[PDB]
Amino acid sequence: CQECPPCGPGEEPYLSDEDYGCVPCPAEKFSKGGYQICRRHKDCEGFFRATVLTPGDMENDAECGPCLPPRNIYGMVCYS
Amino acid sequence: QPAVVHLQGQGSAIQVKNDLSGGVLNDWSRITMNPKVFKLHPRSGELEVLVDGTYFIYSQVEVYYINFTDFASYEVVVDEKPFLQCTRSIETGKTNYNTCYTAGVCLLKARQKIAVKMVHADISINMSKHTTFFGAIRLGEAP
Amino acid sequence: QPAVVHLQGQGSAIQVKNDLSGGVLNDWSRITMNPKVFKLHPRSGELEVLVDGTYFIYSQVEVYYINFTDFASYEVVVDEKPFLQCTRSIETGKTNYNTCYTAGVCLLKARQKIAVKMVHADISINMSKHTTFFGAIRLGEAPA
């Protein structure tokens, strides 16, 4: 009983001789996993915030900064 | 005893018009799935039954952003054919946190595909494990 | 049976002389790909074939602006050696959106890398996910 072939950062499992492998991640998506599927970047309007750390393909999720696009200033999910 | 299943949103928020295939939610997590009665197809997001019976099916979707609609709506489809429908009027153009729950009971036949399908395209759904979930319970024998 | 790959541009607008290294388009978003037959190098923009075979390779590049050249061109290269070449004369100093498609069949050996290489000019490319793409079909084996 061996371990399922782990994936690299910015790459998600490709399940289907079995052609099970690892495919890269789409443009607005990332993967900090070995068996984690590819997921979308953190939302600026879903959190009401701005982007301090612009997101990338691997071990790189979007990190939000402040939230004043009307004028929201609170710690986790901020509001008016 | 009876077999139950409770799928969950695996974490990140999705855009229906881009991250989905025909508005069908597919990012599920088999947390307490009974293997004797249910089988989930990950790429499609279909909850397939294995035993002919009476099933109580529940679901919840968290919609937080809409464009071009005035209302968000979804169907609980039984073989790409509607059974239940949950619709909620939401403010268009802005963030509105709303969980939308629907549940019902119906007789099912084996190898039947159940899915959660959004009727509109421009929707932002938060696939959280606590706000978005999809479940089914075999209550018993089909009359 | 057949193994395919389709890559799309990631939205942004590339200026080739300032955004690319040697004209090679690198920001490819994979939408369909067999990782057993294909491999994607993001920093280099290469599409490696991992097995021997007969490949149908295609590409499309959306050029929207040109400076002092009026000659927008690119090549589908294999191991830096050209195979296909798409040329397009455009009015200079004016935004003119126009997609540029080329495709062809060739025999490839395992580990050969394929890329989309722009000519060294002040060209502007709109890397939209629907106007700028790069793909391939492994039709079958490469005989003898």
Residue numbers in the entry:
A (entry chain C): 44 to 59, 66 to 118, 127 to 137
B (entry chain B): 247 to 389
C (entry chain A): 247 to 390
Text from the published report:
EDA is a tumor necrosis factor (TNF) family member, which functions together with its cognate receptor EDAR during ectodermal organ development. Mutations of EDA have long been known to cause X‐linked hypohidrotic dysplasia in humans characterized by primary defects in teeth, hair and sweat glands. EDA·A1 and EDA·A2 interact with two distinct receptors EDAR and XEDAR respectively via binding of their THDs to the cysteine-rich domains (CRDS) in their receptors. Here, we report the crystal structure of EDA C-terminal TNF homology domain bound to the N-terminal cysteine-rich domains of EDAR.
To reveal the structural basis for the interaction between EDA·A1THD and EDARCRDS, we crystallized the EDA·A1THD-EDARCRDS complex and determined its structure using the single-wavelength anomalous dispersion (SAD) method at a resolution of 2.8 Å. The crystal structure reveals that EDA·A1THD and EDARCRDS form a heterohexameric complex, displaying a triangular-shaped architecture with an EDA·A1THD trimer in the center and three EDARCRDS molecules at the vertexes of the complex. The structure of the THD trimer in the complex is almost identical to that of the crystal structure of the apo EDA·A1, indicating that binding to the receptor does not cause substantial structural changes of the ligand. Each EDARCRDS molecular binds across the convex surface of a single EDA·A1THD in the trimer, burying about 1340 Å2 of total solvent accessible surface area at the intermolecular interface. The 1:1 binding mode between EDA·A1 and EDAR is markedly different from those previously observed in other TNF-receptor complex structures, such as TNF-TNFR2 and RANKL-RANK, in which each receptor binds into the concaved groove formed by two adjacent ligand protomers of the receptor. At the EDA·A1THD-EDARCRDS interface, although all three CRDs of EDAR form direct contacts with EDA·A1THD, the second CRD mediates most of the interactions with the ligand. The driving force for the binding of EDA·A1THD to EDARCRDS is predominantly electrostatic interactions via three pairs of charged patches on the surfaces of the receptor and the ligand with complementary electrostatic potentials. A cluster of acidic and polar residues in EDA·A1THD (Gln256, Gln261, Asp265, Asp273) mediate a panel of electrostatic interactions with positively charged residues in EDARCRD2 (Lys78, Arg88, Arg89), tightly tethering antiparallel β3-β4 motif of EDARCRDS to the surface of EDA·A1THD. Instead, the presence of Val307 and Glu308 extend the length of strand βC of EDA·A1THD so that the aromatic sidechains of Tyr310, Try311 and Tyr343 pack together to form a hydrophobic patch that makes intimate contacts with helix α1 from EDARCDR2. Our crystal structure predicts that a glutamate substitution of Ala259 would severely deform the saddle-shaped depression of EDA·A1 whereas a glycine replacement of Asp265 reduces the acidic surface area at the interface.
